[PDB]
């Protein structure tokens, strides 16, 4: 049931219902420099795979291991499970007529600031009523981990933990940490505990009380969830700062318990600063 897939440009593929003898699969990579892709389905008398997936208010995609059109569609996933915040209007759809050939063009663009914190793979393509199909696999590259001011955006890599450091002090007393809606906090008890070990890996975390770090500590100093849409914000009242410089580890895991990990070392400045003793 293989349709015939040809590449017209990087991230632009064309499928027709001409029966090919071997399965050819397209390969798209979406990142900041190449935030868009085009799927072109030839109408031989031209639907995006999965059917309706580029028109619906909840956009839908194939699992990356779908074996064919029916396997894809009977198991169709949600685009937002791969890219949080994805919207139908990230697709622009066009009918094109050329020299007696009708095709439909589905051009998908990810706003680059919304690239996910971990690499994702799904696939889409073209499908026909007689069950013919072409797959185009989509790799969505991640937003780099970063610390911008006091906002810490975690990220995940299979080639090792991500380590980020950020500062807290009396006069710059809040930080925001984002694990992403797809991921998970470490330790899970982070509003009460930090990792005294050298990783937020549950096997290495060695959770200890945040009363080791702050004075008059309260879990109420955290607002928002680490895996909520805006991450979690930790705000330290001025009296909360100890006399000594300190640090603690909090972070994120890809899955509830498992790697990759993102380790955020929060460096707490002692109060008073030496100038003001």
TrEMBL record:
<feature type="disulfide bond">
    <location>
        <begin position="15"/>
        <end position="134"/>
    </location>
</feature>
<feature type="disulfide bond">
    <location>
        <begin position="154"/>
        <end position="262"/>
    </location>
</feature>
<keyword id="KW-0472">Membrane</keyword>
<feature type="disulfide bond">
    <location>
        <begin position="62"/>
        <end position="72"/>
    </location>
</feature>
<protein>
    <submittedName>
        <fullName>Surface antigen</fullName>
    </submittedName>
</protein>
<feature type="disulfide bond">
    <location>
        <begin position="179"/>
        <end position="252"/>
    </location>
</feature>
<keyword id="KW-0812">Transmembrane</keyword>
<feature type="disulfide bond">
    <location>
        <begin position="195"/>
        <end position="205"/>
    </location>
</feature>
<feature type="domain" description="SRS">
    <location>
        <begin position="12"/>
        <end position="140"/>
    </location>
</feature>
<feature type="disulfide bond">
    <location>
        <begin position="41"/>
        <end position="126"/>
    </location>
</feature>
<dbReference type="GO" id="GO:0016020">
    <property type="term" value="C:membrane"/>
</dbReference>
<keyword id="KW-1133">Transmembrane helix</keyword>
<feature type="domain" description="SRS">
    <location>
        <begin position="152"/>
        <end position="268"/>
    </location>
</feature>
